[PDB]
Amino acid sequence: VDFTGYWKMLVNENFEEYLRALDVNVALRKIANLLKPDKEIVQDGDHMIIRTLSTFRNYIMDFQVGKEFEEDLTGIDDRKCMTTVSWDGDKLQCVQKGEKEGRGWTQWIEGDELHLEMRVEGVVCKQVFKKVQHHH
Ligand SMILES: C[C@@H](c1cccs1)N(C)Cc1nc(C(c2ccccc2)c2ccccc2)no1
């Protein structure tokens, strides 16, 4: 599996409850639900760069698969986590150790679709992106 590409958001399901489970305030929650970020991903061996891009915020993950790293989430839910992204078959599994229980996400590909499931304290958000070729 190779996630390299430019991806455009198609659906964003149960995002508001996921943010509510992170204790994001109502007003910020309302702003975040209106965002439809693109994803620019470069998979370079075990080195992974995931750029989540929007006018409101560019969130950059730059990590080595299998290596724990300190993830700065202050601009999101005002927290930090010790995060580990690992391979699980053809799926990418992320565990975010921190204050919130069961926090993490799973990423995988189906055809021309990038699938992203985010989780925290039983709440599941599901996002699907489409691979695109017009670069901005
Ligand atoms: C970005 C996301 C992931 C990146 C790679 C796997 S998940 N993560 C940080 C949690 C998350 N923030 C968001 C979303 C967001 C922004 C502000 C507050 C709460 C959520 C967002 C972040 C950045 C750009 C545009 C919208 N929606 O989800």
Residue numbers in the entry: 2 to 137
From the paper:
Cellular retinol-binding protein 1 (CRBP1) is the primary transporter of all-trans-retinol (atROL) in the eye, and its inhibition has recently been shown to protect mouse retinas from light-induced retinal damage. We determine binding affinities for the newly identified compounds and elucidate mechanisms of their interaction with the protein by solving high-resolution X-ray structures of human CRBP1 in complex with selected inhibitors. Consistent with the fluorescence data, all of the crystallized compounds acted as competitive inhibitors of CRBP1, occupying the same binding site as atROL. Apart from specific hydrogen bonds, effective binding of retinoids or other high-affinity ligands to CRBPs requires interactions with the entry portal region of the protein, comprising α-helix I and II, as well as hairpin turns between β-strands 3–4 and 5–6.
As anticipated, the substitution of the hydrophobic 4-methylphenyl cyclopentyl group in inhibitor 1 with diphenylmethyl moieties yielded a functional CRBP1 inhibitor, denoted as compound number 5. For example, compounds that contain the 1,2,4-oxadiazole ring form a hydrogen bond between their nitrogen atom N(2) and an ordered water molecule, whose spatial position is further stabilized by the interaction with the side chain of Q128 (inhibitors 1, 3, 5, and 6). A secondary interaction site is formed between the nitrogen atom of the N-methyl group and the ordered water molecule (inhibitor 1, 5, and 6), which in turn is involved in an extended network of hydrogen bonding with the side chains of residues Y19, W106, and R104. The spatial position of these compounds reveals an overlap between the orientation of the β-ionone ring of atROL and the methylphenyl or cyclopentyl rings (inhibitors 1, 2, and 6), diphenylmethyl rings (inhibitors 3 and 5), or the tetrahydronaphthalene moiety of inhibitor 4. The stability of the main chain in the α-helices I/II and the loop between β-strands 5 and 6 correlates with the binding affinity of the tested compounds, showing a notable reduction for ligands with lower binding affinities. It is noteworthy that inhibitor 2, 3, and 5 exhibit a greater propensity to stabilize the α-helices I/II region in comparison to compounds 1, 4, and 6. Additionally, it is interesting to note that certain nonretinoid ligands have the potential to enhance conformational flexibility in segments of CRBP1 that remain well-structured even in the protein’s apo form. This phenomenon is particularly observed in inhibitors 2, 3, and 5, where their binding leads to a partial destabilization of β-strands 6 and 7. Interestingly, the magnitude of changes in conformational flexibility depends on the type of inhibitor. abn-CBD and inhibitors 2, 3, and 5 exhibited the strongest stabilizing effect on the portal region, followed by inhibitors 1, 4, and 6.
